[PDB]
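#dry-run=false #mode=assembly
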Amino acid sequence: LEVEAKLAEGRKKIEVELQEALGSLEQQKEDTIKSLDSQISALSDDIVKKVLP
Amino acid sequence: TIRNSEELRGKAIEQLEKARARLKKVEMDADQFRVNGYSEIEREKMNLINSTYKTLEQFEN
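#status=ok
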């Protein structure tokens, strides 16, 4: 009985911690893409001149 | 008849010693069973919490 209740609770906890970690990785990834958007403005500057052979 | 009365007495006392002998044997066996059942109740929630941590590592990394 004790392991049943506590393990239901434990698997619930594991899945909701999975969802929290997922949200955190999502927000971090989006921030990195925006910083990359600034870096890639610099990239857009330094590409078009060489793209023409 | 005196002899055979004594013999029936003997058979009765042999059933007595059978009763007490089985009492003692099975009570020691149930004592060992109590020890090993204490052990089996020790070994369970550790396995289940290690399974929980298996799920932990299987999702986060």
